[PDB]
Design an enzyme around this catalytic site. Sequence first.
Site, short mmCIF file in Angstrom:
data_model
loop_
_atom_site.label_atom_id
_atom_site.label_comp_id
_atom_site.label_asym_id
_atom_site.label_seq_id
_atom_site.Cartn_x
_atom_site.Cartn_y
_atom_site.Cartn_z
CB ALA A 1 2.37 4.74 7.53
CB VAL B 1 1.44 -0.06 5.72
CG1 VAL B 1 1.16 1.43 5.80
CG2 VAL B 1 0.14 -0.87 5.76
CB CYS B 2 4.88 3.05 2.10
SG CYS B 2 6.11 4.39 2.22
CB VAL B 3 7.70 3.43 7.11
CG1 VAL B 3 8.86 3.60 6.14
CG2 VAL B 3 7.87 4.32 8.32
CG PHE C 1 -1.97 -1.07 1.24
CD1 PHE C 1 -1.64 -2.35 1.68
CD2 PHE C 1 -3.28 -0.82 0.81
CE1 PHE C 1 -2.61 -3.36 1.70
CE2 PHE C 1 -4.25 -1.83 0.83
CZ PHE C 1 -3.91 -3.10 1.27
#
Lengths: 130, 130, 101, 101, 132, 132
Positions: free
Chosen positions: A82, A77-79, A39
């Site tokens: 996020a 989930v891309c940090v 994502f």
Amino acid sequence: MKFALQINEGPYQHQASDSAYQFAKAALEKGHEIFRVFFYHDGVNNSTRLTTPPQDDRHIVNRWAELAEQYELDMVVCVAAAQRRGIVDEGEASRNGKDATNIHPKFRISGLGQLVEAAIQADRLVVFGD
Amino acid sequence: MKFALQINEGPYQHQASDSAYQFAKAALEKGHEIFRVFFYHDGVNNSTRLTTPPQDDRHIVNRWAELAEQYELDMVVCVAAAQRRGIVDEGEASRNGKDATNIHPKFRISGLGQLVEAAIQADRLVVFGD
Amino acid sequence: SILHTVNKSPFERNSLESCLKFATEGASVLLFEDGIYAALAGTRVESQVTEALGKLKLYVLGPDLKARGFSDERVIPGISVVDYAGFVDLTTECDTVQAWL
Amino acid sequence: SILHTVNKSPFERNSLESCLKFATEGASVLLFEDGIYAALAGTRVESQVTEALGKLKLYVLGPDLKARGFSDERVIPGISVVDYAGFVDLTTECDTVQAWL
Amino acid sequence: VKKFMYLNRKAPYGTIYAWEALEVVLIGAAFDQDVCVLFLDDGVYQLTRGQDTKGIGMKNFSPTYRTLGDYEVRRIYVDRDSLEARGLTQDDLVEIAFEDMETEEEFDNIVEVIDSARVSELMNESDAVFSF
Amino acid sequence: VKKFMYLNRKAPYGTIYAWEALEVVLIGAAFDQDVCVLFLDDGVYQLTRGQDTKGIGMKNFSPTYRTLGDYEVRRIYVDRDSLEARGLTQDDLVEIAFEDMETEEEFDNIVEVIDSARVSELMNESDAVFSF
């Protein structure tokens, strides 16, 4: 065949996630493997556990959680994405000093190298966005 | 003049929020009155307190909070929109049975009626979106 | 009476066209955000935009022109450049604002 | 070898056009989500879409046609209707997937 | 072993796609795959020169494009038809220097403006395409 | 007292704008302002008939349009140029009945297809316009 699905939009606002999900269920059911679901952008918003969607309609987050549960899918989930939008897990909460977390345990936060990583390992890179 | 700003998109993903903010600050400085800032659709995501945006760039959520602090702005977050996307305050946490909250104290959750309400009370309804 | 706002690129969205089609005599149109590219001289849509200068008052937001790499000189003569303070003014001078998204 | 995917309305975005312009002989094109409207007979883009039938293989996602009120009968003759299981197959038959957003 | 295309088609700042897409290229540079970044349609506005984001209260990230050579990004294309329809020439774009430190050769600018047929060629050579 | 226009120009299901916009109309009905709903461009696809959302796993919310009469929404227009561009006729749309219980009269359908000139007239009459 090994797949890699990239999702760029948040839930409900754009159909992208729903389409990606329908695609993943159909692929999985055909015997194909989904190497990773990554994502990015507002896509990361498909990992919060704080949604309370209308009961008479689908629950996108829980749906993804269940499919993940069933087929042991690695949903990343891309940090950076996020951090900019507010998706927080144990680690982030601690490092960034937040007073709460909201990520759904079925999703994990990681680096953007996990997306490139996937593109290389999978046979096909299908992207669902705006 | 009395204004009613409507923001339909999330932070960073679309410029909408930034534009409304710039619009608001410029209107306020001019002596006008912002009756209400209402977030609908992905707009409700401008209210989470869990973001950690790049330091060398603007912090959208806090910016709005500071401006709201300075001019006592009434910032409202559509409740239905929030339940769908994941914005939670004390009430919502309590009614939905969530293990945490993530709304910034400067935003309040309320009804869509508050949007229509402002449309009537303000002289101008400026809508920012995609 | 109406202040239309177009925030999308005329090369990506039909918004600019739709706006120019329904805006009437004496109305104002403001190009901001990605809408800015339509106020630039030389593009595929200079002609129709220029045509619009006939019955409409055209404006483009400075801040967004600059952010995208264009000075006021790259703008189509006839289209006025305004800043956020001016944007505010446009909304109070006209009676109603209508966002073409 | 390339399965193109267009998910946006041809009356709102330029994505369908750009795809049709670069997709080459023997390539496949899948219209889904809002991109479905381009497969409907009688629209303003019918001919250019029909034209593409020449060197391209055109598909439309059934689920999305029905969601928006259109039976396969409303589709332009030549455009194959497929479901998600079909979507999947298209991505495996071709060698690469290029999304036009 | 693999050929990757980064398909950029949206104007910058209106949305985050331009900036965040750039982030992936820097990270993807490290995996040393045959990478190529293509700018099409409004994507060309991503490389314009002279951006000044002060007025809109955002950080100007354009400088980063000019550092792509340091990341070993050699293949950077621009659709001319797009430049044309938008009334621009390569002169409106920034330059992206690159030096193959492995053979000394220094190039002042590797930004190549290509024609439609070339663009369709590059797509067909790609093993994977990243879209934003 | 005030005249409110709800401008709908996006297709349904692809984006949530259709649905969540409709929600606003329903909620604003209670404040009894002179409300009118206008469908333009791809917005006309919002009133299509025969929607079956089962395939895409989403709830079909179209039935809600057919109940706007019960919410005192008398003014419901549709741009004809838009229908024509998309190869549609009022026969492709749903009917929205309305009965002025205050005077008995019962209409089978108040969805009125209008020409460009009329549409522009309506915009100029509105005191505020909601966009999505």
